[PDB]
């Protein structure tokens, strides 16, 4: 055989994405942000747990935080950066020959689409996941070094060609082919209402004290920069399961629906990364793969 | 009684039942439901599905109802309009949880806050373990989580696509 997983291996991210931070402005003007503030008010009624008689009638001081945009603007600005940073098959932790053989296996991996997907999945509007929805106009202004790109909707699952996507995305391979870092600006704007429902992130809630203590940066509503990452990295329709991108994963896998796109079927990241170096010769979006879920990092040893 | 289709595409971003009730929120605010159209779900298994089926009696055309869920185009499908001889529309069912009946109390019989919760203190707590849908409310400034169950036809309908008595 040939080289198996070291006793240490992991790579860092590589797309590193800001935490948003979320304004309320107008399309008429779109500079004159608010605060979308998150509050508390108290929830009482939620009773009936299981093996309950007579207990099942407290009356639950339950502040869920709730996230409303402003009767005053109709228009969401949901305002955040994107990072990405190149020297993306140097491992940090465990760098050595499994990595490098690596590198030079991962030399024709095609950085143009995988950039092109990368600025698709901000120009579609993924990122804004239950945010986009009741909106009929979305824009997308792409505020990378001295050039503003506008973006109106790609749909986040259909995967045309694009222009002026694919002209960011040639800088954006440029920076992830080789070394060095790119910042483009994000600012999202939709028309969802007075009193609109807006849909932050949510957080960790165990015990029955609270039901929502929603991701929150100095009181203002935000998303979580790992789940703005997790819409980064929905690349994948090499999975040979269907047609619905999947965020990239070592087993393809979401906790949502609680299936497995790739567990099994020799599309695994380890099983396939093994074939990668050890001496197997494979195809291109199966290579694209394993170099996207090397943008997005993990640990790959044991 | 022809009836005309709307299918939730499968989308693993937003929920399938979200988008149901962001449907179900539209079809509300923008008309539509006003004496006669009646909205079916042929899928109750535990949720409420991602396929609608409009069946009123004048008919639904595929114009008046592609602009009213003009928000939703991202992740929408609407169908032909067919027929049905029969549809299985369903009606509104609430649940009631204690201080929903507290307040109720003191305010008709006129009885002390001490009075209505020793009446009501070994009562109440119901909770529905049938399908239900996350509709909100624009009148009154709240979320809530609306219950649909299957039993007989009725002739007219409310402003949900529901049942009337």
Known sequence: TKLKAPAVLAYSRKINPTNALMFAVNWSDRDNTTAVMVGTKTVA????????????????????????????????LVKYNVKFVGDVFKAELGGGEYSNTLQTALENTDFGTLAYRYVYNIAAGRTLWRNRVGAESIETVITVNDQTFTFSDLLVNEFDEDVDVAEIADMVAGVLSGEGFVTLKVEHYMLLGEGSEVFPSQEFVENSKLSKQLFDLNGQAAMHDQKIGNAIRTIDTWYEDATTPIAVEPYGSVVRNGVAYRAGNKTDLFTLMDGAVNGKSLTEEDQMFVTANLIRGGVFGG | YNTISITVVDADDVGVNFVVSKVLSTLHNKGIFNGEVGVTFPRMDKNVGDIITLFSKTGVDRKVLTSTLNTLTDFIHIGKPKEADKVKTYRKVDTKSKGKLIRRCIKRKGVSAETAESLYGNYKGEKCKLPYIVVNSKSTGQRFSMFLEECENSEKFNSYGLCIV
Do not use: E, M, Y
């Open chain 1, 45 to 76: 009624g939620t009773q009936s747990v299981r093996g309950n008689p007579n207990d099942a009638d407290k009356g639950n001081i339950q502040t869920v935080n709730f996230a409303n945009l402003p009767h005053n603007k109709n228009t969401l």
